[PDB]
Structures are given as C-alpha cells and as structure tokens.
Paper text:
We obtained several crystal forms of the in vitro flavinylated S. oneidensis NqrC protein (lane 11), expressed in a soluble version minus the N‐terminal membrane anchor, and phased the structure via the single‐wavelength anomalous dispersion method using the selenomethionyl‐substituted protein. There are four independent monomers of NqrC_So in the asymmetric unit, and the r.m.s.d. for superposition of these monomers ranges from 0.3 to 0.7 Å for over 214 Cα atoms. John Wiley & Sons, LtdThe modified threonine (T225) lies at the N‐terminal end of the C‐terminal alpha helix of NqrC_So, in a groove formed by a number of conserved protein side chains. Surface representations illustrating the electrostatic potential of the NqrC_So structure reveal the high solvent exposure of the phosphoester‐threonyl‐FMN residue (47% solvent accessible surface exposure for the threonine side chain; 55% exposure for the isoalloxazine ring of the FMN; 49% exposure for the remaining atoms of the FMN). An electrostatic potential calculation of the NqrC_So flavinylation target site shows that the environment in the binding cleft for the FMN is positively charged. One of the highly conserved residues in the NqrC/RnfG proteins is K207. The side chain of this residue is located near the nucleophilic T225 and the phosphate of the pT‐FMN modification. In solution at physiological pH of 7.5, this lysine in the isolated NqrC protein is solvent‐exposed and protonated, but in complex with its cognate Ftp protein, the lysine would be buried from the solvent in the FAD binding pocket. Interaction with the negatively charged phosphate of FAD may abstract a proton to yield the free‐base form of the conserved lysine, which would reduce the pKa sufficiently to allow deprotonation of the T225 hydroxyl. The K207A mutation exhibited no detectable in vitro flavinylation activity (lane 12), confirming the hypothesis of essentiality.
We recently reported a flavin‐trafficking protein (Ftp) in the syphilis spirochete Treponema pallidum (Ftp_Tp) as the first bacterial metal‐dependent FAD pyrophosphatase that hydrolyzes FAD into AMP and FMN in the periplasm. Orthologs of Ftp_Tp in other bacteria (formerly ApbE) appear to lack this hydrolytic activity; rather, they flavinylate the redox subunit, NqrC, via their metal‐dependent FMN transferase activity. In the current study, we identified a bimetal center in the crystal structure of Escherichia coli Ftp (Ftp_Ec) and show via mutagenesis that a single amino acid substitution converts it from an FAD‐binding protein to a Mg2+‐dependent FAD pyrophosphatase (Ftp_Tp‐like). A high‐resolution structure of the Ftp‐mediated flavinylated protein of Shewanella oneidensis NqrC identified an essential lysine in phosphoester‐threonyl‐FMN bond formation in the posttranslationally modified flavoproteins.
Author numbering: 0, 33 to 254
The structure:
C-alpha cells in the first residue's frame, strides 16, 4: 500500500512531465490526469527493432530497474552518455492534439553530466527532428553550477531547435558565443557550467543515435 502511494505519486509526476514536454496545457486541479488519459498513448517499444512490446502496466514500468537487469539489458557499443548498460525496451509517449492528429512523441533520455546521471524527457514533432520541449527532472550536479538543467528558463531554449542536419546526422551543440534565433542547432551554454551542458548534449546524441530511438523513429516514418 505504501507501494501504491509511491507509484501513484510517480505516475502523477510522470504525466505532468510528459504533458509539459509536449507543450499540452495541464489544466487546473487534477485535470492533467484526464488530459493525459485522452491525449497520450504510452508505449513500451523494443529499442533494437522499434517494435511495440506488451506490458500490463506501462505507466508503472520501472526503467531504472530494466536497464540493470542482465536479462532485459545490454552494454552499448558506443557508450556516449556513459550509462554503462542499456535496457532493451524503452517507454515512449505518443501525444495527440484535440483534432486527434499526432502532436509529438515524448521519449526518455538520460546520461552522465559531470558528476551525476541526469534524467529527462524530450518531445519531438512528427518530423522527428524539431524539438517540442525538453524537461529535466533529476540530477546530482553541483547546485549553483550544474543545477541549471532543471531551470525552465534554460529548458525553454530547446523549443524549436532541431536534432539533425540534412545529412541526418545529430547536430545539436551547446554554444558559449551567444546563440542567435537562426542557429537552429544551437543552445545557450551556461557559463561556468559547461561540462554539465556537454553531458546533456551527449545524452541526446546517444538516445537519438543508432543505439537509441533512431530505429523506432524510422519505423514510424514508414508506417
């Protein structure tokens, strides 16, 4: 029962994170639960094949646990995000507007910053390139330096940016020179905290890379 309250608490935070990333209004009170239930379709997908896998309670799926279990995980070839081990399946979310048309796909990403693992979600538009929103919800980086990652002021900068170039190659780079509106692959680095930012950069590089959600996206582009 203590289990239920905990799961109930994390499911609420999860629902809010996903809607926030997808730029959907959470409504007032507990309406976010109803909005999520109507406009979001949780999915467990096989990262290698891109196929949808089955689970009785997708929202309660423990991705931390799945990543370390030897029978449901593997070691990445190019461990860019320094995660050491990767789950076979990932939980993703398809988000639809009121018209019922696909609005975005929200996927989990995480990777080592400078001193700790950083966890979050990225919402991408149906072109699977343009970012609809980034939400970081957990980290262990030094407060006052690397804890900017959870600051909405900084996270909002990612909106509208594009992950890949015309060669289909990951192109996002954190920039210190001060990013201009036309720099669609650039995000402002937080001076004095560059190493954390490069971690987030590498986190997305992996999870939108060949060992990440690329197969899954290529499957959606087809059918």
């Amino acid at each position: 029962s203590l289990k239920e309250r905990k799961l109930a608490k994390k499911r609420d935070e999860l629902q809010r994170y996903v809607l926030m990333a997808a730029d959907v209004n959470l409504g007032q009170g507990n309406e976010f639960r109803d909005i999520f239930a109507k406009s979001v379709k949780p999915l467990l997908i096989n990262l290698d094949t891109g196929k949808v896998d089955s689970d009785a309670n997708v929202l309660d799926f423990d991705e931390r646990m799945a990543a370390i279990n030897p029978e449901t995980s593997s070691t990445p070839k190019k461990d860019i995000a320094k995660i050491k081990t990767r789950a076979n399946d990932a939980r993703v979310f398809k988000v639809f507007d009121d018209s019922g048309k696909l609005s975005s796909v929200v996927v989990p990403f995480y990777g080592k910053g400078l001193w700790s693992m950083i966890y979050g979600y990225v919402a991408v538009e149906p072109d699977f390139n343009t970012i609809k929103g980034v939400v970081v919800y957990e980290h262990g980086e030094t407060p006052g330096i690397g804890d900017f990652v959870t600051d909405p002021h900084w996270l909002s900068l990612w909106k509208g940016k594009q992950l890949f170039d015309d060669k289909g190659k990951f192109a996002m780079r954190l920039v210190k020179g001060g990013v201009k509106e036309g720099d669609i692959h650039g995000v402002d680095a937080v001076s004095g905290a560059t190493m954390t930012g490069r971690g987030v950069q590498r986190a997305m590089e992996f999870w939108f890379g060949v060992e990440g959600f690329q197969t899954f996206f290529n499957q959606l582009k087809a059918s």
